[PDB]
Symmetry: C2
Subunit: 188 residues, 2 copies
């Protein structure tokens, strides 16, 4: 109660502690989707994200949705990934002098809150898997984002790419929803 | 710290989140939030503060301030901290959980797009702002690309919005921050 403290589950600490370099976009997203599955198993939401150095593929920090277990509605994957990267690099601005250009790789297009977080973070690129329609058509609300939000990011100098490994990302979302119920199911 | 995400709070804010406070009148609530603004500036933070109160009684639940630079966290806006600390105190991610008294976010200035979203997901049923978006822009702070008619967006989701409460007092503090 004397500070904002969002604990990270073991698999996420593991992810943030082990050096990892993933050059290809598919490799980066593949890893982020692995975190989605691991997070679901760790009582978290079906969302994950990670900040990588854009030009080297070095993983800086990863985050996942810890809203329920962390008793914090702001604990979205993007918020955690961006904040943990900033804490590690010791700056609130990921585009600060001397720092490498950063990229946020996310399992799904950001909700309105994370959309804003991306703009303030300093990352220079956003790479998404599942599309907004995918998540919303599955019961996930992205919230009221501004018109042509992608264009807005582009105007902020933030490059946007979406649909990367979309099929696998959507499969994981539907898999989560298939088990998102109170009635026990051994398959879950 | 390494593992978890840990945003430390300055002395005045730790105190604000532990001392009993019941402020019935909206102006009393905002007056207190503005006091946190000045204290935050003295504590190397941005000129913004916010607090979550029980809407009817005025019982203070939690307070937050802009700790972006000293906390090395761009998401550490006043609103994010206030809503998050309130959720931690009430043991839930949803401030609208059945049984909980209606909550209200009293903030020193209209929210940026990130905090606009945070308010929506928080469970608060009311938002009360002092300084207007234009006042914030007037000292170099960006509200970001918020959707058209953001206030209507909140009202459409069951969140009442009040703006301009003690606006001039809030602006006096914003201008002072800019000058110094
Ligand atoms: N892009 C998105 C979309 C949704 N969510 C999460 O799933 C819940 C319902 O949409 C939301 O409450 C939130 O936990 C998310 O983290 N990120
Ligand atoms: Zn989000
Ligand atoms: Zn904000």
């Amino acid at each position: 109660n004397d500070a904002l403290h969002i604990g990270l589950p073991p698999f996420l600490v593991q992810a943030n502690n082990e050096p990892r370099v993933l050059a290809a976009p598919e490799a980066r997203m593949g890893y982020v989707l692995e975190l989605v599955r691991a997070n679901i198993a760790a009582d978290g939401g079906p969302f994950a994200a990670a900040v990588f150095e854009r030009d080297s593929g070095l993983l800086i920090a990863a985050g996942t949705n810890r809203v329920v277990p962390g008793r914090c509605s702001a604990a979205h994957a993007e918020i955690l990934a961006l904040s943990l990267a900033q804490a590690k690099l010791d700056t609130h601005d990921l585009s600060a002098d001397g720092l490498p250009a950063c990229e946020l790789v996310t399992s799904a297009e950001p909700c309105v809150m994370c959309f804003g977080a991306v703009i303030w973070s300093g990352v220079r690129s956003l790479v998404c898997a599942a599309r907004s329609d995918d998540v919303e058509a599955i019961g996930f609300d992205e919230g009221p984002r501004p018109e042509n939000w992608m264009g807005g990011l582009e105007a902020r100098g933030i490059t946007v790419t979406t649909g990367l490994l979309r099929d696998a990302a959507c499969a994981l979302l539907r898999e989560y929803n298939a088990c998102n119920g109170v009635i026990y199911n051994a398959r879950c």
